[PDB]
């Protein structure tokens, strides 16, 4: 359970992300695909992309980054009271997209890295630890839904 002070750190940096949702979404998905190429393979939509320059030039990838970060921002702003938001996301990611919980750990690392690069003044160690806790809570709750459905592993 995050404290109020931890949530304030999380949402303070997140409010900075929302000034350029699309640029953050590109940076995060590109970092994910470069650092963990198995993740790119899960996207029929993107797996034709073979270089970082091609990834950066894809408008469709930029659009999907906005989709992803809009969903995550709506979860973070619930401060843990996010059951309604996680139900459809766990269902699609477990049963349709077939995304292991481990790949959610990978995108969480990519999110933290990009926030540290773009917002160092608002993403000191206290805020890094709080965002790590928020993304851990996300993964914990998604993992419980995966386990219900028979996909935790
Ligand atoms: C912060 C974590 C993530 C969030 C908030 C998120 C959010 C979303 C949303 C909102 C959609 C569209 C609606 C839906 O299908 O449920 C989507 C689609 C999808 N996501 Fe995620 N996602 C996350 C992580 C991942 C990861 C790590 C992968 C793969 C490694 C992944 C793979 C996919 C795929 C394959 C689609 C369908 C893309 C398409 O063909 O249109 N997601 N995601």
CATH class equals Mainly Alpha
Give helix % range: over 70%
CATH architecture descriptor: Orthogonal Bundle
CATH fold-level topology = Globin-like
* Order of SSEs: HHHHHHHH
Domain count: the total is 1
**Distinct helical segment count:** 8
For the sheet with most strands, the description reads: none
> Can you list the ligands bound to this structure?
protoporphyrin IX containing FE
- The portion of residues forming beta strands comes to under 5%
Shape: globular
Distance between the termini: 25 Å
What is the gyration radius calculated from CA atoms?
A: 15 Å
Question: What is the H level of CATH, i.e. the homologous superfamily?
Answer: Globins
Give the total of beta strands. Answer: 0
Structural class from helices and strands?
A: mainly alpha
PDB class: oxygen transport
Keywords: haem protein, myoglobin, ligand migration, photodissociation, Heme, Iron, Metal-binding, Muscle protein, Oxygen transport, Transport
Assembly: monomeric
Entry title: Carbonmonoxy Sperm Whale Myoglobin at 120 K: Laser on [300 min]
Question: What does this protein structure show overall?
Answer:
The protein has helices at 4-17, 21-35, 37-40, 52-57, 59-76, 83-96, 101-118, 125-149. It has a single domain (1-153), classed as Globin-like, CATH 1.10.490. The chain has eight helices and no strands. The relative contact order is 0.18. It is an all-alpha fold and 153 residues long. α1 packs across α8 (125-149), α2 packs across α5 (59-76) and α2 packs across α7. It is 75% helix and 0% strand. Protoporphyrin IX containing FE (HEM) binds next to α5, α6 and α7. Residues 1-147 form the Globin domain. One of its GO terms (biological process) is removal of superoxide radicals. It catalyses: Fe(III)-heme b-[protein] + nitric oxide + H2O = Fe(II)-heme b-[protein] + nitrite + 2 H(+); H2O2 + AH2 = A + 2 H2O. Its EC number is 1.7.-.-, 1.11.1.-.
């Amino acid at each position: 359970v995050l404290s109020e002070g931890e949530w304030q750190l999380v949402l303070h940096v997140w409010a900075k992300v929302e000034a350029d949702v699309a640029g953050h979404g590109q940076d995060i998905l590109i970092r994910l695909f470069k650092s963990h190429p198995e993740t790119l393979e899960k996207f029929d939509r993107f797996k034709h992309l073979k270089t970082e320059a091609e990834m950066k030039a894809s408008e469709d990838l930029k659009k999907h980054g906005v989709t992803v970060l809009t969903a995550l921002g709506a979860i973070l702003k619930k401060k843990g009271h996010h059951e309604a938001e996680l139900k459809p996301l766990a269902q699609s990611h477990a049963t349709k997209h077939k995304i292991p919980i481990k790949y959610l750990e990978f995108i969480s690392e990519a999110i933290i890295h990009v926030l540290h690069s773009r917002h160092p003044g608002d993403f000191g160690a206290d805020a890094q630890g709080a965002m790590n806790k928020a993304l851990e809570l996300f993964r914990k709750d998604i993992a419980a839904k995966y386990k219900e459905l028979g996909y935790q592993g």
